[PDB]
Design a protein around this nucleic acid. Structure first.
Lengths: 187, 64, 145, 75
RNA sequence: AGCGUGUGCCUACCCUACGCCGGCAGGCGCGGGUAACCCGUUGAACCCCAUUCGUGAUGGGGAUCGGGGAUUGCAAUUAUUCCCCAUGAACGAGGAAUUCCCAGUAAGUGCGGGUCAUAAGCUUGCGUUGAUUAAGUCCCUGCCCUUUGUACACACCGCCCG
RNA sequence: AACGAGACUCUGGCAUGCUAACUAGUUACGCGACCCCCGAGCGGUCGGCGUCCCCCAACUUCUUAGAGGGACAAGUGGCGU
């Protein structure tokens, strides 16, 4: 009985992580299943402690950002809640699979460091791949809503659905495919 | 013309490099033939036993 | 719908018949958000309808209430002309009448050459403000000789 | 620089389309109705409440900032 | 919520419950407090739930300016401060440059103290909501120690040649 | 051998252990009073709600603030002329 927790409405057991480099850094299932994407936990206190935070709470933290929105976490939990309800109507699929596949597609795997207009290509670590993916798809949702009748709950659903299939209509896929093109010229 | 993706496992961290200390320098051991090893430079935070994705296996780099 | 007329002319000014009735009539000078709500409340009009949905006798009921507030029991403390200096009356002044009422006030101050009338004439700030660093509308001047 | 020109009341060419399009959409919301029919958000809010009392659509969720509706329990 | 203040010792003023009159600012009456005792269970703001608007310089923004009413004071015009109806600017995330910051922190949000007859867009304290990124380097600007060179000691913002 | 550093002083986080409170509270009842029947069951002994009110009841968990306690790189595994 208490070993299965449905996050209000959505099951975790049927979720799959299909890139073996990220299985250690995308926290889902087992001890990482909770009822709500809100805790008061001290995740900032040591270097790798960040990797133990549930991925739906990391999306919720990164969304309360742009100046006029600092500290407003209760508003930001309902944006994620209403985005997952729209994703289930459009796809028919589990919303946690759509989020996991959007993160696996959006993180860049080569990039070029700066040395003097002059750059050199380098590898990207799995913790920086998951950090980059969240920031890109939050930015994509935030830029589209700024002068449209579309709510941010509808724009965050559109951005996650397009990223989970790699369509290049999303902001995150265009920016990933720009970073890897520039680095390929700096070998 | 084209070449495939390779996966490799971190076996040691060697130090930090670049003008501002920005890149870690690291030793990696491949996922197919476990007898092979090379050295690489990595942009983010890295820990022993991480798995990297390499877009080319044949390039190798020393101190930038 | 009825495909009824969606632009209308009320007091020598044009109203868009497309906004909510309480925000359409504020296109008249002398009629703000606060006064427009109270006029429609005395006129017995439902605030939910668009301004093109009023009948011909409903607009004449609103116009005849705007021009005579004190006979429909709109209070004295609501009005934009109080004890008018030359004849002692209380009223609301609207449209091109508000332009002339300000035009008479600035000339009345200038004719006796009081300090207000001179500041309005020289084009300077009339109320208590400083003038060293704000309100600049000329051109940058160079130090060279 | 550009302008939209959204309608404040229906006409039969768009009102018959409102009643014909009901089965096509998995997600029904005031904003998607607004941009697709060229309708203001306050007319889109009013039109979706009529279809609910006619029994033609299902309410999925309601909150101050977001309503959600869907197709009538098949497809 | 938390930190505080309160009848001024020459010097003449304090913090306020409750009832009544007024749309409001405000007015009259009558009680408590020299304070873990009275204002006071200090019913704070953002936040939370429901409604209306619909991508329009718009119900965003509120500068500028007309008319009327209270309160301080010996005196308010070059508008002390406060209240009401009206008027409705620039501004659609900012060129070359450049500041501060590593956890209950940054940022958001309101409340006390000082100055005070009248009065914070300042400053000095308090609580409340609460992240992203780092766990490193000497590249840029600087500091400490040692070896080294010098025509400097007014000490490189030095000295000096045709 | 001397000063600076550090120690030192104030402050934050822990004590159901101590001292003890009508200018601070809790629990409980001799009980007393208003309201509801929603409750095994009645309009009740018994239930629910209280900054409604006495105690010449018991007490110190929550508030105040005095004395002491506690943390040392002390324990276990690596690395170090």
């Amino acid at each position: 009985t208490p070993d299965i927790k449905l996050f209000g409405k959505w099951s975790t057991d049927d979720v799959q992580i299909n890139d073996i480099s990220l299985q250690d850094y995308i926290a889902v299932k087992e001890k990482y299943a909770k009822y709500l994407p809100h805790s008061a936990g001290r995740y900032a206190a040591k270097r790798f402690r960040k990797a133990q935070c549930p991925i739906v709470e990391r999306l919720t933290n990164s969304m309360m950002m742009h100046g006029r929105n600092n500290g407003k976490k209760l508003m930001t939990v309902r944006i994620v809640k209403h985005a997952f309800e729209i994703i289930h109507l459009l796809t028919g699929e589990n919303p946690l699979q759509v989020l996991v596949n959007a993160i696996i597609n959006s993180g860049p795997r080569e990039d070029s460091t700066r040395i003097g207009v002059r750059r050199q290509a380098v590898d990207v670590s799995p913790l920086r791949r998951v950090n980059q993916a969240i920031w890109l798809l939050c930015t994509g949702a935030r830029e589209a809503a700024f002068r449209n009748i579309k709510t941010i709950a509808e724009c965050l659903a559109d951005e996650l659905i397009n990223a989970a299939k790699g369509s290049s209509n999303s902001y995150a896929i265009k920016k990933k495919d720009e970073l890897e093109r520039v680095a390929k010229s700096n070998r | 013309r084209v070449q495939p993706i390779k996966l490799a496992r971190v076996t040691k961290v060697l130090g930090r490099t670049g003008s501002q200390g920005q890149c870690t320098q690291v030793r990696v051991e491949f996922m197919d033939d476990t007898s092979r090893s090379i050295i690489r430079n990595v942009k983010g935070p890295v820990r022993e036993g991480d798995v990297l994705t390499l877009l080319e296996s044949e390039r190798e780099a020393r101190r930038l | 719908p009825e495909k009824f007329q969606h632009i209308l002319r009320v007091l020598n000014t044009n109203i868009d018949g497309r906004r909510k009735i309480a925000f359409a009539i504020t296109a008249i000078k002398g009629v703000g958000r606060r006064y427009a709500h109270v006029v429609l409340r005395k006129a017995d009009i439902d605030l939910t309808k668009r301004a093109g949905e009023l009948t011909e006798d409903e607009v004449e009921r609103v116009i005849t209430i705007m021009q005579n507030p004190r006979q429909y029991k709109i209070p004295d403390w609501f009005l934009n002309r109080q004890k008018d200096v030359k004849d002692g009356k209380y009223s609301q002044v609207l449209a091109n009448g508000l332009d002339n009422k300000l035009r008479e006030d600035l000339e009345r101050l200038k004719k006796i050459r009081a300090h207000r009338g001179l500041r309005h004439f020289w084009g300077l700030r009339v109320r208590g403000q400083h003038t060293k660093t704000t309100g600049r509308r000329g051109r940058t001047v160079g130090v060279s000789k | 620089r550009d302008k939209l020109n959204n309608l404040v009341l229906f006409d039969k060419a768009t009102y018959d389309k409102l009643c014909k399009e009901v089965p096509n959409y998995k997600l029904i919301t005031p904003a998607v109705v607004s941009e697709r029919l060229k309708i203001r958000g306050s007319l889109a809010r009013a039109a979706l409440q009529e279809l609910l009392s006619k029994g033609l659509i299902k309410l999925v969720s309601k909150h101050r900032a977001q309503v959600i509706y869907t197709r009538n329990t098949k497809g």
